[PDB]
């Protein structure tokens, strides 16, 4: 078969995790849900209660 | 038609620690 699967992009902000040995393996886009924006605000992937 | 956490590329060539 044949599939292009082309998708556009928009300027947004991202919170990139920088693990050792030069890898990412996890990211969060702070434009989809308020939980992602909260994660990007305090710079943490595990948010406590409050 | 859904990019489930796909499209994350290195924005620069800077090595960063944890």
């Amino acid at each position: 078969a044949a599939a292009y699967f082309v998708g556009y992009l928009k300027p947004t902000t991202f919170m990139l995790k920088y693990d050792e040995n030069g890898t990412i393996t996890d990211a969060v886009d702070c434009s989809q849900n308020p939980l992602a924006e909260l994660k990007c605000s305090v710079k943490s992937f595990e948010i406590d209660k409050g | 038609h859904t990019s489930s956490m796909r499209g994350v590329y290195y924005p620069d060539e800077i090595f960063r620690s944890d």
Binding site: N21 | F15, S17
Partner: protein
């Protein structure tokens, strides 16, 4: 083999080689790695660059 050297009104297209300095490590010295200026101690570590 005749090498015709010219110095006409034109930008510097051909120049001589650019000899780099030695690597002075374990000493607070000035460094210039192609624009990166400043002063620091050149010491290795156990990092993994890409």
């Amino acid at each position: 083999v005749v090498l015709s050297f010219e110095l006409l009104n034109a930008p510097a297209t051909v120049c001589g080689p650019k000899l780099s300095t030695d690597l002075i490590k374990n000493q607070c010295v000035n460094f210039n790695f192609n624009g990166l200026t400043g002063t620091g101690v050149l010491t290795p570590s156990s990092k993994r660059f890409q």
